[PDB]
């Protein structure tokens, strides 16, 4: 799978592919890996259980309501329980989340990571996306969305675990 | 073992083989891997331990009266307990479950997948069935049962762990 | 990779995909895996080194020159050296070969194999192709070419090591 | 795969199944695992690679004329070359060979075994066949062929690597 | 070890050998592996701890008293706790149990399995017994007891972990 | 290590890094991984042992005069000797070689690959370079050298086994 | 370590060696592996950790006053706690225990074994002692102590983990 | 298997069992493991291939023809080639040989070994036989033959790879 | 990662790199691995998970107000909870902590080490930093910061898991 | 072991320790690892067999006799045979060699390597020496000899496989 | 096994034990591990296979006349042939050889070590002997033989693979 988040000219996005793999074969080819949150104010993507999602994203939503839209904090409070709560622990995944404020990754380890330029690329195709994204972001005037897209394709082209079904979620602000 | 589920015009099925393997020998040939649940309004097939399935399915019923029979919603709860709970957490199984609204997989990884056309193929012979089920569903006017059956047999021919004993539960909602 | 060969109504074919994989990434996406031999009378497909090919196919040609078009024999004489000659031994591959006479697989083990219905499906995507080919061949009037094609796609859809680039070599005779 | 050889009243047989397994999938179902050698005066069955068996049986014939058809004496030599020689030493196979004088196994370890009553059962399903073959040969007046066949099927039901396709070469010397 | 249960002409039995092995040597050669239960109305055999037995068989006895001789049910209720009760869980074994009603196996997994013809053959020698039992049961008029016996010998003859000390428990009803 | 080759407008390059890793430590940082061969008409880069590459490139030159500088044809032969020959067969290396006619990989598996646009990226950082190289070559008017260099650096940032020391051999045929 | 127990005419013994091994070196040579329990009416030997044995034996006593000294019955309870209980479950040891009614092994697998003639031989040198103990007990009028001792020494000669330091506890009930 | 050789009162013997094992099942139960050589003057036993035997024993005979009955030397000269001659090397076995002069073991390693008291016990059952042989030899007036026998039985009782079929070769001289 | 701590004349520092590695790729380059604790009177660096460190450091503060800021004494308590407590026990990290009284390591093994001269070097690049830090501290009048920095860079050059991004916290007590 | 070579102010050196290790213990503590060659003009150090040395150093000498003092070339010509000659191949070691011209490493791989600043540090203690050598070389006016020495000590202090016995070979020229 | 060599006042020895271990059992106790070579002017001991040692010592003698009995020079050659030659290269052994000029180890790695005071201790019990041998040679006026013997016994007490059977060859040159 491949999750790519970019941010340029008052525009932030998260894009993902839809391949779920089991062994050496494709189980499903259109898995929605990028949803929306906090009253369609906060976008996100992720790699993992379709249920682990529906549990981590709900909690995260409430964590914001307990920290007035302050993405970071709620994000900080999220990864917190995620490594503390006996049950919540078994949950495995990689949340990529971004609002107008900023964007970041969250690992079961409880880490809240802010990548070099809000550039995010998690998943087995992550680095190929990163490379292509970085390339575009430094040598062209393309848009945050055009980046993730093109970068995602590049990935799905290299990654045997990434396909060409996309699910993009933008966000404008300036 | 191979569990196959096809769905065509108010007709959804679930077919399974009946082999139980121990090491390299066949322990049982007529294992019933498909059954009805929730006042017959729900069909289900399972890969793995019988008693484990009995456990998981029973609880599934429980969750259905809890959510007025809403498959998914009632099913996601099960995708929960299964990984969160101490005991269930131990159970090893793959669930295929369908009703008139949709078909879907349920795994102990808190994952609830609903493949491309409600087409489901799980178990070691899973892909082979999917392969055949796909070809048929797209080049013939054959029905769900006809496909499920024909597909299951193809699986049984390829898969060393799937035999030709069948059990099919159908659901007509037309 | 996935090589599929079919034979129906005085028509035989060999179709292959074009993905070459290294680890978890695609090295090349358009590898020609199906050629032609013996003055464009004999068709073949293969899984392996581009050189192993241009060596095992050249030889095979000469073996036919030593056995008047008689496929099988040159094929037998081929797998013969392929398991004896000190050097030729290190060569690794899976040749699928078919003439108007018949079709068959050759392994470095020296085996000459004629599958059930001149139906061939080698490579990691082999069985998924077989499953879909078999389905079609038994439930529809489609053509040998149409089979291999459709079958190949089905494969590339399931197999993480098989793509959708094709290379088909037909043959007519009646 | 299972190779079985029963011997009763001037009637000696060798029955094998026809499954060839690759990983967990059936590659071929009609593999011929039994054949005649030395002007039909000798019958044989084999576990393993066909081309390897062909090679070994060829040499075995060689040794027979080389010893006036004396099974054992000609068979021990083969046990010799097999372990010693560079190439042959590589061949992976198990041999079951019979004539009117006796039945016997031949392995790459330069071992030439002749079981309790010329009762031979080699291959993954070997024992199960032996079990049934024993029971029959000691509680029924059934014939060699009848036992071999019945035993082989029992094997095919137990052994996940043995199917129900048969090839039986018989020999009458009565 | 080898446990064999058969059922013919209003007669059901369970027979076992007495070898306990530790590594590559015999610890004991006369282990009683087939006892009686529920006021000598229910017979059984088993593979495992001499204590695990004395705990599982006692419980099972009470489970019958809580389900009026209804073998199956008590059996169902048994395998239940066996995979639920924290303590009872560590118990490893394979109970074979049979009454006039029917016969079945119980695994730590909680499964209650009824084999094809009440034919039961658990333990490392299981399949060899099965093969010989099946053979006899289909080609001779021998008795349920004569079967298990002969079948058990066949096993102990093939199985390096099975000897020739028997412990048979019959049961008549018609 | 990363070797990258881009090709644009009569300009073809090959850029490599210069890190040599031993275990988890950097042994050398200025390894020259690219060089010229065949009267400067041919440029090459290599992953692996320097002495091995020197040996292989030497022979490659040999094959070139032996085939009037026809890359491929002279390159396939090398693919030959490499897998066959006793000594060469031992050499561990990956070759990237280009001239004005085409770019192509050369592996010890007697494989001669020529990627989608003569775009080559081998070595542990290979894909990442490919990713960025792809993105650039499709969204900017940058040159081969500009891409190769920029791609190589991206690789050097991602790949823990690739540094930022470069060596670039260019070729202009325009 | 080797614990041996022979029993002849109102004379039952238990002899053990005294080596404690760590890796390939001898840590202690005079380990006391045999001792008296329950007002001297009971002798015992143990393979494994001293403190673990002290723990297990103490509890064993406890169980004896609980069941009026009935060895077996009181011993089976111990075969219980040992595998059911959290703490004990961790203890690693093999118990040899005898009184005037019988001798018997006790393992953490809820197993209580009473070998052929009350002859017990446990520990890495166990078999060798059994072998010798058997020969002597069946071809000489020697006594328990004489056998146990002579057997233990034979063990000490064969077994690299058994030395010649002894500790014997005898019980005369004649 | 188990080979036991003893020597007492101008009598030397070699006794062996007849079990050949493959995995966890018995292939044959009456293998002759003790022969006779040098015009029935020299006795021997062995563990290994029936061919390795009929090659290492034939040679040994000729080595004696080259060293006037002098056992030891031919034995030395034997183990000599057995570790040098390119071919003879692959041979695997354990020859036990004894004449009126002395007795000794020979290993493919080329070693010639004379055990403590001409007492030999090779094979997986070796030590158990040694333990019992030693016991008898030191505490009873039994005969060399009686020893090997009784010892062999003791072995077959402990060793899962040793049965109770014997083959003894005595020798008288005084 | 490399954490280095040098201490010279009322000047104690702690420098860390900023690379976070996943597999063989760099996930983040500016990780802050050093920070202040306990009203800035205490500096600290950490190898491992950020959130884990946040957890451990916070508790460390807790322990300081508990022991009036006595580093060691307050630190030993932490060396406790860390291995005794259920949750903390799971945290994976290496702590480097200094104040004006002393520097010291803290590991989850209930270990509190204070190296030779308060010189600390932990993390995969640890030794290399120690090596350089040692040389400098003993052949130059350079300061703590100067050494820490220069040492860290040397580490960053040798260690494949350490980059050149720094974060230094100094403490002047002179 | 640890070999360190440095070059400063018309002075070059090679210094080594003297520990030879086998498992976890020291075999010898004063191994001479630095010699002299080519009529005491060329210095060298090495890691490996005392014989491999007295063979690779003798040869190297002759290679210089075949290339008028020209270090590099004889060095190239050396690593040449060292990777070709059937025998010489099995030789294992790491020669460090340096003349007034230059210094460099030679590996059985046939590589000739000239490190950054004629700075060499091979052996398990290699990097620690490099780190300390580099530090000194860049922050002090110390001499080549003084460097190698101090560096070597630093190594032996960190490296469990390096001691404090030295063997230095200097060289003056200007 | 332990081989020890002490040297004092024109008296040099070599003492070995006599245990041969197979798995965890003692195969022989009186193995002669020390002997004389070269007209008794040379004494040697060896760890490993007797036949291998015999072979190596034979060649060693060969080299001695070939070098006028110069230990080292004749010994290095042996270190040569040993690693280079096809057959010898297979031999698994460790050599301890002494004469009046010096003592020294000889390994298959073409290594010829001569410990600190001609003190040699090889074999699994090697170090322990070295330890005691060192202590004695530095706090007592005891002789070579006295130390060797006393050291060997200490080894025999510690090392599970060393017994107390000795063989000592001494040499007086005073």
Cα distance from E66 to chain H (closest Cα, Å)?
42
Phi and psi at D13, nearest 5°, equal: -125, 180
Chain I residues whose beta carbon lies within 8 Å of the beta carbon of residue J127? 127-128, 131, 158
d(CA J59, CA J82): 10
d(CA J56, CA J82): 8
Q: How many CB atoms lie within 10 A of CB B157?
A: 19
Known binding-site residue numbers of G for Na(+)? 156, 159, 162
DSSP character string of chain H: --EEEEE-SSBEEEEE---EEETTEEEES----EEEETTTTEEEEEEE-HHHHHHHHHHHHHHHHTTTT-HHHHHHHHHHHTTTSHHHHH--EEEEEE-SS-EEEEETT--EE--TTS-EEESTTHHHHHHHHHHHHHH----HHHHHHHHHHHHHHHBTT--S--EEE--B--
Asked whether B162 and B10 are in contact (CB, 8 A), the reply is: no
Chain G residues whose beta carbon lies within 8 Å of the beta carbon of residue E20? 113
Is residue J29 classed exposed, middle or buried when 0-12, 13-18 and 19+ CB atoms within 10 A define those classes? middle
Q: How many CB atoms lie within 10 A of CB B165?
A: 16
Query: Could D135 and E138 be called an inter-chain contact, meaning their C-beta atoms sit closer than 8 Å?
Result: no
Nearest to B137 by CA among J76, F31, C140: C140
Burial F25-60 (b: 16+ CB within 10 A, else e): bbbbeebebbbebbeeebbbbbbbbbbbbbbbbebb
Strand stretches in chain I, DSSP E: 3-5, 7-8, 11-16, 20-22, 25-28, 34-37, 42-48, 93-98, 103-107, 120-122, 167-172
d(CA C138, CA C144): 12
Q: How many CB atoms lie within 10 A of CB D145?
A: 16
Asked whether K110 and K80 are in contact (CB, 8 A), the reply is: yes
Q: Is G45 helix (H, G, I), strand (E, B) or coil?
A: strand
Strand stretches in F66-143, DSSP E: 93-98, 103-107, 120-122
Give every CB contact of residue J12 below 8 A, 6+ residues apart in sequence: J5, J6, J43, J98, J99, J100, J103, J118, J144, J170, J171
Query: Mutate which of G135, G139, G140 to disrupt the H interface (most H C-beta within 10 Å)?
Result: G135
Sign, CA torsion I98/I101/I105/I106: negative
Query: Mutate which of A20, A30, A50, A93 to disrupt the B interface (most B C-beta within 10 Å)?
Result: A50
Chain D residues whose beta carbon lies within 8 Å of the beta carbon of residue E130? 128, 131, 154, 158
Query: Could B51 and E110 be called an inter-chain contact, meaning their C-beta atoms sit closer than 8 Å?
Result: yes
DSSP character string of E59-113: HHHHHHHTTTT-HHHHHHHHHHHHHHSHHHHT--EEEEEE-SS-EEEEETT--EE
The distance from CA G19 to its chain's CA centroid, rounded to whole angstroms, is: 15
Nearest to H2 by CA among H117, H142, H160, H173: H160
- Pairs of residues, one from chain A and one from chain I, whose beta carbons lie less than 8 Å apart: 27
Q: Which residues are registered as beta bridge partners of I159?
A: F25
Asked whether A77 and A66 are in contact (CB, 8 A), the reply is: yes
- Pairs of residues, one from chain A and one from chain B, whose beta carbons lie less than 8 Å apart: 39
Query: Could F24 and I157 be called an inter-chain contact, meaning their C-beta atoms sit closer than 8 Å?
Result: no
Nearest to D50 by CA among D18, D79, D6, D72: D18
* Dihedral of the alpha carbons of F41, F44, F49, F53, in degrees to the nearest 10: -40
Q: How many CB atoms lie within 10 A of CB J160?
A: 11
- Using a CB–CB cut-off of 8 Å, the residues of B that contact D are 21, 24-26, 29, 124, 128, 157-161
**Three-state SS sequence of A49-107:** CHHHHHHHHHHHHHHHHCCCCCHHHHHHHHHHHHHHCHHHHCCCEEEEEECCCCEEEEE
d(CA C55, CA J149): 58
Asked whether E17 and E162 are in contact (CB, 8 A), the reply is: yes
Length of chain D: 174
Nearest to D160 by CA among I82, B29, F93, A4: B29
Q: Which residues are registered as beta bridge partners of C28?
A: C20
- Using a CB–CB cut-off of 8 Å, the residues of F that contact J are 25, 28-30, 49-52, 55, 87
Burial B110-144 (b: 16+ CB within 10 A, else e): bbbbbbeebbbbbbbbbbbbbbbbbbbbebeebbb
d(CA K171, CA E23): 48
* Dihedral of the alpha carbons of F141, F146, F152, F153, in degrees to the nearest 10: -100
Distances, alpha carbon A120 to alpha carbons A12, A46, A98, A113, F126, in Å:
11, 11, 10, 10, 20
d(CA J155, CA B81): 56
Report how many domains make up chain G.
1
d(CA E149, CA E157): 12
Q: How many CB atoms lie within 10 A of CB I87?
A: 12
Tell whether B126 is in a known binding site.
no
d(CA A76, CA D145): 76
Resolution (A): 2.8
The distance from CA I110 to its chain's CA centroid, rounded to whole angstroms, is: 17
Give every CB contact of residue C100 below 8 A, 6+ residues apart in sequence: C12, C41, C171, C173
Beta G167-172 vs H3-7: how paired, if at all?
unpaired
The active-site residue out of K1, K84, K107, K140 is K1
- Pairs of residues, one from chain B and one from chain D, whose beta carbons lie less than 8 Å apart: 31
Query: Could I160 and F157 be called an inter-chain contact, meaning their C-beta atoms sit closer than 8 Å?
Result: no
Is residue D109 classed exposed, middle or buried when 0-12, 13-18 and 19+ CB atoms within 10 A define those classes? middle
d(CA E146, CA E126): 17
- What helix, strand, coil percent values describe chain E, rounded to 5? 35, 30, 35
Give every CB contact of residue D117 below 8 A, 6+ residues apart in sequence: D7, D137
Query: Could H160 and E124 be called an inter-chain contact, meaning their C-beta atoms sit closer than 8 Å?
Result: no
d(CA I51, CA I88): 12
Query: Could A111 and I50 be called an inter-chain contact, meaning their C-beta atoms sit closer than 8 Å?
Result: yes
Q: Is D153 helix (H, G, I), strand (E, B) or coil?
A: helix
**DSSP classification of residue D15:** E
d(CA C30, CA F113): 10
Longest dimension (CA), chain A: 47
Within a 13 Å sphere around the CA of K135, how many CA atoms are in the beta-carbon half?
9
d(CA I109, CA I94): 10
Chains within contact range of chain E (3+ C-beta pairs < 8 Å): B, D, G, H
Query: Could G110 and E28 be called an inter-chain contact, meaning their C-beta atoms sit closer than 8 Å?
Result: no
d(CA F45, CA F103): 11
**Among partner residues J128, J136, J157, which is closest to I128 by beta-carbon distance?**
J128
Give every CB contact of residue K55 below 8 A, 6+ residues apart in sequence: H110, K88, K91
The angle, 0 to 180 degrees and rounded to 10, between the axes of the packed helices G71-84 and G50-66 is 130
**DSSP classification of residue G163:** -
d(CA E1, CA K20): 35
d(CA C124, CA C156): 10
Q: In chain G, which residue ranges form alpha helices assigned H by DSSP?
A: 50-66, 71-84, 126-137, 144-158
Give every CB contact of residue I103 below 8 A, 6+ residues apart in sequence: I5, I7, I12, I14, I96, I97, I114, I115, I118, I119, I120
Examine the residue annotation and report whether K1 is marked as an active-site residue of this protein. yes
The angle, 0 to 180 degrees and rounded to 10, between the axes of the packed helices D71-84 and D50-65 is 130
Beta F11-16 vs F167-172: how paired, if at all?
antiparallel
d(CA I2, CA I126): 5
d(CA F105, CA F96): 5
Length of chain G: 174
In angstroms and rounded to an integer, the radius of gyration of the C-alpha atoms of chain A is 15
Helices (H) and strands (E) in chain C, counts: 5, 11
d(CA F61, CA F82): 14
d(CA G154, CA G149): 9
Tell whether D167 is in a known binding site.
no
Nearest to D170 by CA among D1, D2, D4: D4
Query: Could D49 and C109 be called an inter-chain contact, meaning their C-beta atoms sit closer than 8 Å?
Result: yes
d(CA C163, CA C156): 5
Is residue C119 classed exposed, middle or buried when 0-12, 13-18 and 19+ CB atoms within 10 A define those classes? buried
Cα distance from E134 to chain D (closest Cα, Å)?
7
Nearest to I15 by CA among I160, I143, I158, I111: I143
Nearest to B148 by CA among B43, B65, B59, B22: B43
Burial G90-111 (b: 16+ CB within 10 A, else e): ebebbbbbbbeeebbbbbbbbb
d(CA E127, CA E116): 14
Residues of the domain holding F92: 1-174
Longest dimension (CA), chain K: 47
Chain B residues whose beta carbon lies within 8 Å of the beta carbon of residue E83? 51
Cα nearest neighbour of A154 on chain F? F131
Q: Which residues are registered as beta bridge partners of G46?
A: G95
**DSSP classification of residue G89:** G
Q: How many CB atoms lie within 10 A of CB K142?
A: 15
Chain A residues whose beta carbon lies within 8 Å of the beta carbon of residue B115? 27-28
Is residue J157 classed exposed, middle or buried when 0-12, 13-18 and 19+ CB atoms within 10 A define those classes? middle
d(CA I162, CA I3): 10
Nearest to H96 by CA among H31, H4, H7: H4
Q: Which residues are registered as beta bridge partners of C42?
A: C37
Q: Which residues are registered as beta bridge partners of D48?
A: D93
Sign, CA torsion K127/K129/K130/K134: positive
Asked whether F11 and F168 are in contact (CB, 8 A), the reply is: no
Chains within contact range of chain F (3+ C-beta pairs < 8 Å): A, C, I, J
Q: Is D101 helix (H, G, I), strand (E, B) or coil?
A: coil
Does H contact D via 3+ CB–CB distances below 8 Å? yes
Give every CB contact of residue J100 below 8 A, 6+ residues apart in sequence: J12, J41, J171, J173
Does J contact K via 3+ CB–CB distances below 8 Å? yes
Instruction: Classify the phi-psi angles of H69: left when phi > 0, otherwise alpha if psi is within -120 to 50, otherwise beta.
Output: left
Nearest to G106 by CA among G83, G126, G129: G83
d(CA G56, CA K153): 37
Cα nearest neighbour of C157 on chain A? A26
Distances, alpha carbon H70 to alpha carbons H36, H44, H77, H99, in Å:
16, 15, 11, 9
End-to-end CA distance of chain F: give it in Å, rounded: 29
Give every CB contact of residue E107 below 8 A, 6+ residues apart in sequence: E79, E94, E113
The angle, 0 to 180 degrees and rounded to 10, between the axes of the packed helices I50-66 and I71-84 is 130
d(CA H20, CA H34): 14
Nearest to H147 by CA among H158, H164, H161, H134: H134
Across the beta sheet with D42-48, the strand order is: D34-37, D42-48, D93-98, D103-107
CATH of the domain at K162: 3.60.20.10
d(CA A16, CA A149): 9
Query: Could D25 and B157 be called an inter-chain contact, meaning their C-beta atoms sit closer than 8 Å?
Result: no
Asked whether G32 and G64 are in contact (CB, 8 A), the reply is: no
Is residue A49 classed exposed, middle or buried when 0-12, 13-18 and 19+ CB atoms within 10 A define those classes? buried
Query: Could D139 and E139 be called an inter-chain contact, meaning their C-beta atoms sit closer than 8 Å?
Result: yes
d(CA F38, CA F58): 9
End-to-end CA distance of chain I: give it in Å, rounded: 29
Q: Is F33 helix (H, G, I), strand (E, B) or coil?
A: coil
d(CA J105, CA A7): 49
d(CA D79, CA H50): 9
Q: How many CB atoms lie within 10 A of CB J151?
A: 30
Chains within contact range of chain D (3+ C-beta pairs < 8 Å): B, C, E, H
Asked whether I17 and I46 are in contact (CB, 8 A), the reply is: no
d(CA F91, CA F56): 8
């Amino acid at each position: 799978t491949t999750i790519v988040s970019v941010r340029r000219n008052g525009h932030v996005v998260i894009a993902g592919d839809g391949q779920a793999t089991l062994g050496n074969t494709v189980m499903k080819g259109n898995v929605k890996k990028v949803r929306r949150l906090y009253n369609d104010k906060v976008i996100a993507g992720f790699a993992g259980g379709t249920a682990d999602a529906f549990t981590l994203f709900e909690l995260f939503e409430r964590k914001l309501e307990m920290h007035q839209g302050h993405l970071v904090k709620a994000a900080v409070e999220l990864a917190k329980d995620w490594r503390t709560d006996r049950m919540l622990r078994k949950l495995e995944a990689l949340l990529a989340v971004a609002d107008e404020t900023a964007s970041l990754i969250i690992t079961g380890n409880g880490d809240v990571v802010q990548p070099e330029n809000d550039l995010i690329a998690i998943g087995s195709g992550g680095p190929y996306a990163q490379a292509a994204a970085r390339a575009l972001l430094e040598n062209t005037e393309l848009s945050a969305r055009e980046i993730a897209e093109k970068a995602l394709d590049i990935a799905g082209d290299i990654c045997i675990y990434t396909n060409h079904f996309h699910t993009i979620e933008e966000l404008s602000y300036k």
